[PDB]
Ligand binder design. Structure first.
Ligand code: ANP
Ligand code: ANP
Ligand code: MG
Ligand code: MG
Lengths: 311, 309
């Protein structure tokens, strides 16, 4: 078998096989916290995939702390609680949120940190008002719909030792950044950053370039992959269910999508996909996959089929 | 005001080296003197010795990691090298720094084997540059074939056994036709060059979406104030004149006839009109992408050291 990439390859079996000295199981409580998270997520999927994943990440995080100690000694450094940041990328409705939320659950179970914050990139979009002014609100999720000078600043601050760093928050009810709903990140041990753009660089923002990227401040990055045809279906389904804020909202900017019949809805969904989002993926997201530390490849039902980890 | 870098002035740095009294054999002292000779042993002991001590903590910490994971996943084999990249402007001391660290880093039993590849060999051959009218622009994103360079480190971090790299000659001042070097699974590979910290963002004419930085474990940027960089650049030109003194058919043969005052006038024009711009827009902007920053004074003496938090 001849290939050889910068990645170690594992098919489902090989992954769900990895056992570590001292058995991996999940207590009652954990088992609960997760069904509330997605409930479409099977416990077997969690045990076979994410449990071992979290185990993997812990080795990485732990090795880091060990290093912190050695160095803190060598150069004599007071304190400064610099959190370990793990980012999660991928296309729309790929499971970015779910994965993040799940890892945050499991990762807390380690006495080495146990403290894990989670910030989703959506909060860093330009408020609908600004988007309307730039004629971008059918383009939410494109490099121009993001204020990532602010985002890079966020993780930059976190990695700078700034104690309490605040972050904007996006609402899935009114689908707009919450006016005065910014969240305060109080020195966490681990910060998980979920979003479509966590892997992008200034090369993706020529209209307003930046020279130090989000990745420059992220310790470990995870990209959630899936074949195009699948991404299409998942996108469509999200639309079907959310109609892009069409619902929850007096008469959302896209209130008109409410009246759409199923046939019309999916008809619309894939015009939006084929003409907008499919290109966002193809040219702004997909190209960053190889920039990830670990790549998860899913099957039609979100089951993880492959796992690639940088050598 | 806080930042992503820890700061140390010459004093503080030359201070954490007392930890584990570190000396060095007489032959290595010979070695180094041969490398630069303008490099004082004092500077080596005060700066680069503890620098290498630092890198070792990072590298060894990593090997322990490897073991741990190697177990958990039962991967085995594969000799993935630890890559350190060194960036900076022209005549800033990239080569020297790289060659020096290569010396010191090998004295650790965990490593001991450290290759050194310099970015220059990845420039397009003069023939090609001439075709694109870029050979007064050697060092600019377009004078580089970095799809090749990116592939080089990608290959290395892919586990590919023997990976070759093109080599640049400082005699002919061109990439040597059949002079490619083979990198035979070393422990540490040091990549010295001007562009080691750039991204596709600097290559719009032919972008790439996975950067050299994505395959480098530790990056060092050598900094110095503009006025100094100019001096150093000019001094280099005065000394070498783009190989007009070693290649009778050098493309810049005419630089030979220049008298010192003419040479300096020339260099300062090249800098002010070309290289000053390369630095200002393709090189300096990448400084903050470095893991560690070295700041030198008029005499290449390192006055400050910043390491990412
Ligand atoms: N591991 C998983 N198992 C089963 N279903 C999943 C899984 N991950 C995601 N899903 C399904 O996919 C839908 C979207 O998951 P979600 O985590 O919200 O994705 P996302 O990428 O964060 N979405 P978005 O930010 O809106 O582009 C859920 O409602 C689930 O039905
Ligand atoms: N630590 C140092 N101490 C003393 N002199 C130094 C030092 N580093 C560099 N130099 C001087 O600077 C000159 C150039 O050093 P060098 O390491 O070749 O720089 P460089 O960045 O690799 N040059 P180039 O690749 O041609 O842009 C040497 O000839 C020395 O005179
Ligand atoms: Mg989400
Ligand atoms: Mg050199």
């Amino acid at each position: 078998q001849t290939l050889m990439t910068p990645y170690l390859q594992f098919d489902r079996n090989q992954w769900a096989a990895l056992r570590d000295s001292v058995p991996m199981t999940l207590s009652e409580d954990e088992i609960a916290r997760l069904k509330g998270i997605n409930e479409d997520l099977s416990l077997e999927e969690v045990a076979e995939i994410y449990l071992p994943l979290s185990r993997l990440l812990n080795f990485y995080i732990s090795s880091n702390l060990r290093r912190q100690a050695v160095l803190e000694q060598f150069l004599g450094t007071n304190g400064q609680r610099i959190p370990y940041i793990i980012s999660i990328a991928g296309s729309v409705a790929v499971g970015k949120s779910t994965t993040a939320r799940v890892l945050q659950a499991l990762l807390s179970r380690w006495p080495e940190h146990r403290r894990v914050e989670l910030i989703t990139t959506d909060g860093f979009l330009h408020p609908n008002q600004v988007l309307k002014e730039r004629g971008l609100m059918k383009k939410k999720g494109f490099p121009e719909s993001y204020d990532m000078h602010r985002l890079v600043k966020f993780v930059s601050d976190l990695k700078s030792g700034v104690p309490n760093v605040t972050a904007p928050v996006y609402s899935h009810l009114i689908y707009d950044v919450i006016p005065d709903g910014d969240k305060t990140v109080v020195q966490p041990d681990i910060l998980i950053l979920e979003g479509l753009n966590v892997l992008q660089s200034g090369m993706d923002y020529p209209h307003d370039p930046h020279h130090v990227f989000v990745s420059d401040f992220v310790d470990f990055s995870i990209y959630v992959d899936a074949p195009e045809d699948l991404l299409q279906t998942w996108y469509i389904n999200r639309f079907l269910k959310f109609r892009e804020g069409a619902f929850t909202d007096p008469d959302s900017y896209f209130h008109n999508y409410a009246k759409l019949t199923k046939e019309e809805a999916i008809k619309t969904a894939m015009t939006l996909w084929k003409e907008i989002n499919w290109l966002n993926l193809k040219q702004n997201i997909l190209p960053t996959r190889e920039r990830a530390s670990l790549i998860l490849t899913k099957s039609a039902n979100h089951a993880v089929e492959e796992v690639r980890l940088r050598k």
